[PDB]
Amino acid sequence: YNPEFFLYDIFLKFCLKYIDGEICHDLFLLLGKYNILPYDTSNDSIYACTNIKHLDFINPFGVAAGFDKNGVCIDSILKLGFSFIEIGTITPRGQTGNAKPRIFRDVESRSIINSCGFNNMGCDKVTENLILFRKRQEEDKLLSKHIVGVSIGKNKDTVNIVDDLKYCINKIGRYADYIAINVSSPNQEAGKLKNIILSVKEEIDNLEKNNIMNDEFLWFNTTKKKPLVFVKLAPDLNQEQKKEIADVLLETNIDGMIISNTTTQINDIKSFENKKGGVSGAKLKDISTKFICEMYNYTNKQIPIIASGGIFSGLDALEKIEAGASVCQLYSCLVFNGMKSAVQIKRELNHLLYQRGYYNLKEAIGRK
């Protein structure tokens, strides 16, 4: 209980009941931009730290893509106690997205429907923002070791999806701790997808070539090493194409997989009966967890997993890991539970880890 968190969460509870979803979002992002949000300055339990390959996360909680699409509020979101943030999904050139209002929420069910249609300032401007953050990070004790990933995607009317992701890697790759391939927005063909992943890895490695500087100056990023490659998957898939994707990921030795994006396969919300778009929140929890189990099966525990979503509590979080999720991303929780989300969930998971018998977090990964 940090007083500052409780005070803001009254205003946020008010904002939730009354104000438009996206207008709130933008206001809080704006607040964070001018550095007036609370910090979590506490020490994270070394027993609860985690990693994906050589990418080390000080704690298992980050913020999902679509939250800070333009990377304007990275410091403050991180400093709420998150280990990482995944900015974007960015596109090569700026987009307005769909028509407003395009995001709607339901308190009762703790869910969100959205059809943003990939609005973002474009790569050039977002890269400009990330550079500015990376400079600050060198002069801020609270941002050390904190991971920033970049979710990349195509424009709504792109000629070929691969050519777009290359342009993005060329601008932002230097400054990303990892790259999340986004082709899972509700708003693929095995070989078509396989082609993409290999393009990305091939394209990242070209950045190391063309530079005359050592890697240490090559990576203006937390790792100081080349970006890892994650792929994000949509849940609305057959047991067949889920098998087909799993091999592709194995054949490309992809660094990890984000499971999962939003669904359209939910019909049982009375306020959502009106609206169009993908759905996230509590009603996505159980569907998303089964998906992780499934993809953990067809992958033989070889490719690490980033979990999302429906994650609101340490309990919810633990399910994902036992299922075998290495790390977790939150989006809906910050909307409903608020600014204490990171502090609350980290605490709750620390308690539960002890009671279940687990020594460290890593021992809980992939245990029924």
Ligand X SMILES: Cc1cc2nc3c(=O)[nH]c(=O)nc-3n(C[C@H](O)[C@H](O)[C@H](O)COP(=O)(O)O)c2cc1C
Ligand Y SMILES: O=C(O)c1cc(=O)[nH]c(=O)[nH]1
The Cα 313–Cα 153 span in angstroms is 30
Q: Whole-angstrom Cα distance, residue 366 to residue 133?
A: 35
- Known binding residue 331? Answer is yes
Asked if 12 interacts with ligand D67 (CB under 6 A), we say yes
Q: Any known ligand binding at 145?
A: no
Q: Please give the Cα distance from 111 to 49 (Å, whole number).
A: 28
Size of the site for ligand D67 (CB under 6 A): 19
Q: Which does 117 bind (CB under 5 to 8 A by kind): ligand Y, ligand X, ligand D67, none?
A: ligand Y
Q: Which entry of ligand D67, ligand Y, ligand X, none binds 289, CB below 5 to 8 A by partner kind? A: none
Binding site for ligand X (CB under 6 A): 64-66, 69, 89, 103, 112, 114, 116, 151, 182, 232, 261-262, 280-281, 284, 308-311, 330-333
Residues 134 and 221: beta-carbon distance below 8 Å = yes
Q: Is 114 annotated as a binding residue?
A: yes
The reply to whether 158 sits near ligand Y by the rule CB under 6 A is: no
Contact call for residues 85 and 141 (beta carbons, < 8 A): no
CA distance 113 to 62: 21
Asked if residue 117 binds ligand Y (CB under 6 A), the reply is yes
Task: Tell me whether residue 67 or residue 358 sits nearer to ligand Y (CB atom).
Answer: 67
Q: Which listed range, 56-64, 73-81, 182-190, 197-205, lies at the site for ligand Y (CB under 6 A)?
A: 182-190
**Segment (H or E) for 289:** helix 285-297
Taking the C-alpha atoms of residue 323 and residue 335, their distance in angstroms, rounded to an integer, is 25
Is 105 an interacting residue with respect to ligand D67 (CB under 6 A)? Answer: yes
Residue closer to ligand D67 (CB basis): 228 or 328: 328
**Residue 15 or 64 with smaller CB distance to ligand D67:** 15
How many Å from the N-terminal Cα to the C-terminal Cα in the chain?
33
Output 173 or 277, the one with its CB closest to ligand X: 277
Strand 103-106's sheet: what is its strand order? 103-106, 111-114, 278-281
Tokens 């057959």, residue? 238
Beta strands in 157-227 (DSSP E): 178-182
Q: 263, 236 in Cβ contact below 8 A?
A: yes
Q: Is 161 in the site for ligand Y (CB under 6 A)?
A: no
Whether 308 has a binding-site annotation, put simply, is yes
Residues acting as catalytic residues: 185
Residues that bind ligand D67 (CB under 6 A): 12, 15-16, 21-22, 24-25, 28-29, 32, 37, 77, 80, 103, 105, 112, 334-335, 339
